[PDB]
Structure 1
Amino acid sequence: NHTAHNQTRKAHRNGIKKPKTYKYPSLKGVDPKFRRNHKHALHGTAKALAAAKK
């Protein structure tokens, strides 16, 4: 009727993988002010490097 039999077998038949832990997680789920600061900071760094190199 109700049983969790063979669930482990089904799970391990093909193997279990990690969520791939992609680096640079999306700014989703953090402070919007933090996101705005991040965008402004990266824009400023890009401007600074572009001015520096030529």
Structure 2
Amino acid sequence: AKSKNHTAHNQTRKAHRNGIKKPKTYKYPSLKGVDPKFRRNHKHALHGTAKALAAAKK
């Protein structure tokens, strides 16, 4: 009793029912996977700039 092996029939219709809208884009993307030496630097630099801005306009 052999049966159908594979088909992509109806698959694009199914996808396009409520489908292929673009991924939601964000300001401030995640830094995960970014160089950790750079991330250490960025932590220190963001700390410094927040402190400078607080001092300038408390």
Shorter-chain TM range is 0.7 to 0.9
TM-score, reference length from structure 1: 0.86
Question: Moved runs in structure 1, 4+ residues, more than 6 A?
Answer: none
Q: Give 1 or 2 for the bigger CA radius of gyration.
A: 2
> Which blocks of at least 5 consecutive residues in structure 2 are unaligned?
none
Q: Tell me the percent identity.
A: 100
Q: Which residue of 2 aligns with 1:38?
A: 42
TM-score, reference length from structure 2: 0.81
| RMSD over aligned Cα atoms | 1.1
> Which blocks of at least 5 consecutive residues in structure 1 are unaligned?
none
- State how many pairs are aligned: 54
